[model samples]
Target chain A: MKKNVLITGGFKGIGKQVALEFLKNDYHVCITSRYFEKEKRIPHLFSSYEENISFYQLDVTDEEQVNEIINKIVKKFGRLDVLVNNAGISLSDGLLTETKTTDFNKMINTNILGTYFCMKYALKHMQKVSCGAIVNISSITGLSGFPYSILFGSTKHAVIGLTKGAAVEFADKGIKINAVAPGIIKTETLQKEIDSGEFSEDSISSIHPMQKLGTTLDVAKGIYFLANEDNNFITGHVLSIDGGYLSQ
Target chain B: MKKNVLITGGFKGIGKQVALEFLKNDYHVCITSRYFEKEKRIPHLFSSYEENISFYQLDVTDEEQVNEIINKIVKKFGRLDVLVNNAGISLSDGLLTETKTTDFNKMINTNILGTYFCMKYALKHMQKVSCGAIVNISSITGLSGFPYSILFGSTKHAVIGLTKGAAVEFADKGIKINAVAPGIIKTETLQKEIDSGEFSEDSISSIHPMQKLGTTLDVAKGIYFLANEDNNFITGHVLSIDGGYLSQ
Candidate 1:
């Protein structure tokens, strides 16, 4: 039987790749976007053969709306086997003192609260079925303190706590929650910054001890591994998928 | 007059050594214990400086009682300057699958919630003075995943998040909050096990790139530096006094 997956922020960038990976591997994929109009228009980036895809207008920060949506999905599809709470906003590169309150709140609202709301509702449903996996998308900044990225980093750190807490609370009840904290990835996300001439290739990838940033597949594989049944032994763990970034 | 300091579980171990060091430096010292009566009867174990020494009964997990003690100390001294949430328990060691829920919750209640309750109430008082520093005694397991110490590691990880969040939240408000994550330290805390040959010296210490276990002072110095005025610029940071235990 094909597993059902609902991934937030799945229209483009890392989320899109993650969605497609699951789709290609015979999983039902529900990709989400905040902009409904744009979500309807962007051609599926996956090849013609890869097509188990559906798009939903999901703003993961709204708990009531997320609850309603997850309920609707379960009513229609019967079970939500995996939820990838991957929608997050990175700070526009500012120091702690310089970042505006609005920016800070937006990051807090989108990244941390968004994940919180998603899990709150998703778990409500998963708890009934007595089993499922929730994988949060986190970053190296979540695990390390870096200059000019304090607020972004701080929210990511909060998600680590959120993920760990949920994992422990639910592990006994047959639910598994984990996070993948990845380094920079070479996707549309990174390309946009590079095209803007804000960062060069060497400077961007050098943050990791492996001397290279991750690819979309690198992160996707991690999410897939966690979602698989063989991974029951690991819960309440932050699978650091960085190239030894924090380890070094 | 230098401020008075009180530590719970402060007799014949890291607490005693930490107490003596503060006394030697001219700060008035008080150490608390649940077994205060037992510690008082131990003669050579007791420090002789009666004028500057005091004791309190504090089981930090008890919220109302802890605040009562804090209030009495504040009224007596007219001010409180520093707090080290040092009191904690280490389970004999086991995997998460084998550990009892009672033990797990006790660790969480003491390690995570105890720290939270202390910081919450302490901040209420510490904020009045517009200045203070908190040194939470964290362990290396707090920062890493050890094979059999899952529950211990998880609770310890929570301290890191709490430290970072509280540190950033209060940085501008004249309160400095930081946590020191120590590697295996040769203190009364773990010395008995090592001396009894339960844990091999090489297994615990040589795992570090530095090839040695950390002394209590190694960690004490880091705590002192962060707690002192010298480290005002650094906040929301976990200074790992781990002898490169984490670096490897």
Candidate 2:
């Protein structure tokens, strides 16, 4: 009687952590990653819970592929309980003034349109059941525009707008949609910045009242909580797991 | 050379807490409250810093009074460095279905229009100097509507909308605008709900990842951070002092 959950870009970083969290909760978890290759992989991240995990290659920006993949999952599981739209891309240019058209279009396709496609197909399946949860992954940059992150921030903001608009639109249909905005976490991407001296760990961590960078576990917990059925009252909310980064 | 700050409805509750915080920072403060009577009251909340504080009897709902009072503050202080739109009222009726026209109008007047008038006049003065900060007090309900708090939630949402819209429109004018959305804080009003057994402490507290209700000081810190000129990079942001309430 386990719920079926799908996480996009779940092979690495925060998405991988989210998939692990769902598996820990004994849910049947499926993950999509464009670069994942079972032949080249040695041990799975969820090797212990392989019985409850599945993987599919997907590029969310492709609308036809998204529909086929989602429909395939629904057919196999008979229902889709949750969808985590976590696959996204980020870029920092000089500013909005200097943003390249190609970069903007890439982000618009991967972050905004990719999320839109997954949600649209998933909703088609969910509305029939009249019960489901969708948690979109946004960034603190989405909540506030960061310097040199105009393109990424705008797409993240669009994700929030979509979350709010869809939450109200589908409230009567019994499907809930929300989002999580994570501040800086100690992921491989961030570690690279720290290693390259592009980001100072002390200064960045000091900005958060918690006086430390957040872990992927912190964000995973938030995503699971929003998607949990026990949390019935919340919808259209953008939860921040920033260790008090936004608080100040 | 002391900075001047104006807090609306600063005589009681969270407003009083915010006023005290600014006084502790040695800023000259002025508060407006319709219920305040200088002759009847013994001393103000900041009796220790009486020299740095002033009071005016004005209603935020009255646009003319708001303009006049703000003009008087700017005239007296030579410049107004900060404005905190903290004066607001809340009501729990039925859902949107059972909402009363009178109640809705009152909320729109006190929370929305009142904040609007304050910001409008305050921004006029701020734009003249090209440097100022404004923080609007919003609630978790503003970010997420509650079961019986439709009217109150709508007004709070409007406050956030106002914060973001103005933040962008006045960014070039050197006026920064932001909002603080507090989770369930242990105010006297909330204590009443707890005492009356209307609110269950265990269930609600368990909802927040912090396992406790937030303190007024937590919210005060966020407001102070956003309003302080030193933290100049942030604008059009909604800070949440929810002790991870929204996170969960």
Candidate 3:
């Protein structure tokens, strides 16, 4: 049977890429995003694999919506073999002292709390199946702190702690959970940062050992590997797909 | 200021309790397991300061005994700030067809090329006293795998990919390389098949949500917080003290 996979914030960015990868691997893929309808302008996105993919509008911060969507997906698909918690935002609005508490809370709601809620419901269903994999999208900041993105870093760190804590908790239960911490990726937001003179292409590239930014596909490949059951025995592990950024 | 540390099959179990926890934080703690004849029958294990605690006799897969020893203690006390690599052994003789090539090469070179030739002559005197911190005593099979010990978990996952590929090829030479991946720590050599009844005490305890099992003081407090550099910006971090056991 084709396994069902859920990717949060899956309509765009790395989340979308991950969902696409899973679909190609013959998994039935479901994605949630707060603004997925905007993609209707580009119908080609769905035309390729309409039968294999499903989408739902979801504000992951809303606990009710998260629970409802996950329950509905399980009912429709009968089993959810994977959950990729990739619905997150990055904010680097100066240092910790000046950053607004509201902005930080929003990030927490969307990133950590949203991830927790999805994992909570998904695990309940996964427990029934007696097998499942979870891949949380974390960041380099989670592994270590950066100067300006302390809040982002904090939430990402929480995601990792959650990944490890749950991994140990559920090892006996046959659920394999892990995380991927990507270093600077060449996403659309990053391109904007580069264009705005906030960061230069060369400066950003220099931070990575490979002297280049990672692509969304690189991160997607890592997430897929962790989510795939063929690569079992790799639970509770955080694979860094950061062009050797963390290695140094 | 000099910082002295000695390790590499240093003490007994858990690398001589991390040189007795850095001789209780004053540094100047030397250790090596190859020969205990010098300190034999002390029984008390330390009477006082005892001239900053030195003990010799290391095989570390052996080269020239003369150069390694003097260069070791000299560079140790001179540049000194920290070098704690726990040298130990494990041979799970089975599977992998021959077991000869796999088993021999592991103990052949003191797990990961005698810890990369004791950090390449202790980094050629820790690279002209650039100030240092290197903690390579990774455990828990370098964050996974245990079947047949697989060449002792492939030399602790190649000592954490050479401590994060030299922590980004030296991070401008300020020296902060970290490692510690301990899990299921009892150090009796896990013999029971775990499917058998011999290890129920352990098998049950192994199910830690944060259950427990670790502290040779908990992997020597992450090798004394990566060898105590006033908590410098940590680099090449591979900390897995695994009471949570990889979180899943």
Which of the numbered candidates is closest to the native, going by highest DockQ? 3
Ranking by TM-score: 3, 2, 1
Please write out the lDDT profile of model 2 over residues B156-236, one tens digit for every residue: 999999987887677656676889888777777787889999998776776544456766666676687678755443466
DockQ of each: 0.01, 0.03, 0.11
Error of 1 at B78 (Å): 76
Instruction: State model 3's lDDT.
Output: 0.74
lDDT tens digits, residue span A158-189, model 1:
99989877875775567767788887788886
Which 10-residue span in candidate 3 chain B carries the lowest summed lDDT? B187-196
Candidate 1 segments exceeding 4 Å error? A41-43, A49-51, B1-248
Candidate rank order under DockQ: 3, 2, 1
Candidate 3, DockQ to 2 decimals? 0.11
Q: Is candidate 2 or candidate 3 better by TM-score?
A: 3
Model 1, position B159, has a per-residue lDDT of 87
Off by over 4 Å in 2: A36-42, B1-248
- Residue lDDT tens for model 2, A205-243: 765444567777777877886787654445677776664
